[PDB]
Design a protein around this ligand. Structure first.
Ligand SMILES: Cn1ccc([C@@H](CO)NC(=O)c2ccc3c(c2)c2cn(C)nc2n3-c2ccc(C(F)(F)F)cc2)n1
Ligand SMILES: Cn1ccc([C@@H](CO)NC(=O)c2ccc3c(c2)c2cn(C)nc2n3-c2ccc(C(F)(F)F)cc2)n1
Lengths: 219, 216
């Protein structure tokens, strides 16, 4: 299916988590750890593959406010599992004014105030969380919500450093297998769920770089 | 409905033709005549309906360089018919008439975008724009930002708006079409071709569009 994640009501169309480094006075480097620029699934099938949500409940928060309760309230067509391949091939330099950032953009057909909740989870339990509020800007026929260049929390900067100091790729894949992120976008005025993305992670292979694969969550 | 128009190699993700007006030194109005922000399809990811290309050949340029020749060279999965509903409910009072478009690809390419404005199937004005890939958040973006609308189209919009009834506007637009062709400049392969037809918006949701695949 498509490269962006969601429905007409709300689509995540741009996303990246990155490191910017100023090496010299007139030059800088930017490295992307994850992004939604390179779909791993085919654009030729218009239909997305599906994944039974019951088999990912233990990788995300549970009980009150957890994934099963969110999915039960619906709309079920707003729920996706997104697998990200992370590109960790980056030289983290000493004294380089490094900025670790996250950028995202959503689009909607409706003019809304939205609440974006990011829950970073370890073994299915929330370790840190961020809630952002964004307001629509009308652009070329749609409402656009931009979270530009937001700093990464210290937990994630430290996690990335820990991950890169591991001696083997399989150990990085092991650690990423228990690391998940739950993204929930809600209409702040009606409390309706607009988009829910359950994110899982693996290390990118060889020189294929960062990629993502979208699944609709069903059952 | 679907967000973008095109194939796996190239997609039109953003487009609008618009009028910006400055009433006074601190105020600004922007009105969109057409855009691809509201695809009026019942599904977000539909199976596209098809249209036999032989029944639109006489609405677009023919013979050498014409639509039949382009379609025969292929790839045929790059060819679409797009119907636009134009929003002409705008008070034309400092004014800038502009066009914006954005394409995206997984490959680093130099592209050429050809816009042919046609009257009774014959080209009346044409523009060719060249755009170099910009790497952005994991993919390559080709942005033609805020390009001035040609005088022919500004004048056409004024005379169309001056008609007193929607049905007369629709009669004029029956003979007005636009052919958009995007080409990989280095391999000359057709990346995207959109045969555009037009009607005046009737629903008070304003401008909308509908996509069809063109088949032989
Ligand atoms: C207190 N708080 C909690 C959240 C926040 C906000 C602050 O802006 N967000 C981040 O901090 C933030 C950092 C890294 C992030 C993400 C978000 C994010 C979302 N996806 C889909 N992927 C993401 N990645 C990301 C994942 C894996 C890797 C790695 F290790 F595999 F390379 C690197 C980055 N603040
Ligand atoms: C010398 N030259 C020839 C072409 C150019 C370039 C200059 O940037 N493009 C335009 O001028 C240009 C103007 C109006 C345009 C478009 C392009 C365009 C593309 N679609 C899909 N729709 C478009 N519309 C548009 C159609 C109908 C209406 C109306 F009347 F229904 F309201 C209003 C606008 N220069």
């Amino acid at each position: 299916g498509p490269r962006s994640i969601g429905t007409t009501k709300l689509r995540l169309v741009e996303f990246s988590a990155f490191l910017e480094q100023q090496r010299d006075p007139d030059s800088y480097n930017k490295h992307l750890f994850v992004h939604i620029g390179h779909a791993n699934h085919s654009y030729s099938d218009p239909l997305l593959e599906s994944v039974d949500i019951r088999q990912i409940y233990d990788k995300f928060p549970e009980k009150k406010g957890g994934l099963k309760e969110l999915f039960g309230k619906g709309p079920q067509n707003a729920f996706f599992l997104v697998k990200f391949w992370a590109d960790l091939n980056c030289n983290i330099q000493d004294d380089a004014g490094a900025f670790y950032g996250v950028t995202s953009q959503y689009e909607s057909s409706e003019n809304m105030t939205v609440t974006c909740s990011t829950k970073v989870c370890s073994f299915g339990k929330q370790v840190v969380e961020k809630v952002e509020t964004e307001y629509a800007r009308f652009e070329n026929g749609r409402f656009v919500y931009r979270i530009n260049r937001s700093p990464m929390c210290e937990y994630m900067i430290n996690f990335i450093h820990k991950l890169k100091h591991l001696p083997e790729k399989y150990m990085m894949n092991s650690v990423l297998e228990n690391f998940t992120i739950l993204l929930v976008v809600t209409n702040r005025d009606t409390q309706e769920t607009l988009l829910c993305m359950a994110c899982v992670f693996e290390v990118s292979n060889s020189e294929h770089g960062a990629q993502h694969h979208i699944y609709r969550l069903v059952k």
